[PDB]
Amino acid sequence: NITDSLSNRSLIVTTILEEPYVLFKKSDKPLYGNDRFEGYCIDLLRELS
Numbered sequence: 001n002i003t004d005s006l007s008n009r010s011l012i013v014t015t016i017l018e019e020p021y022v023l024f025k026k027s028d029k030p031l032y033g034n035d036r037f038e039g040y041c042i043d044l045l046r047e048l049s
C-alpha cells in the first residue's frame with residue numbers, strides 16, 4: 001500500500017515560467033496560489049498529490 005504516507009506534510013515547490021510546462025490560467029479573475037498555474041507538470045503535481 002503506497003498511499004498517503006506523506007499526508008500531513010506541507011511542501012514548497014518552485015517553478016520557472018516555461019510555456020509548455022506551466023501557464024497562467026486563462027481567466028479574468030485574479031486567482032490565488034496553485035490555481036494561478038496550469039500545464040503539464042502542474043498536472044504531474046496534481047497526480048502526485
Ligand SMILES: *[C@@H]1O[C@H](CO)[C@@H](O[C@@H]2O[C@H](CO)[C@@H](O)[C@H](O)[C@H]2NC(C)=O)[C@H](O)[C@H]1NC(C)=O
Binds near residue numbers: 004005007008
Ligand atoms: C497524520 O496522518 C495520520 C495517518 O496518515 C493520521 O492518523 C490517524 O489519527 C487518528 C487520531 O489520532 C488515529 O486514531 C488513527 O489511528 C491514525 N491513523 C493511523 C493509520 O494510525 C493523523 O490524523 C494525521 N494528523 C492530523 C490530520 O493532524
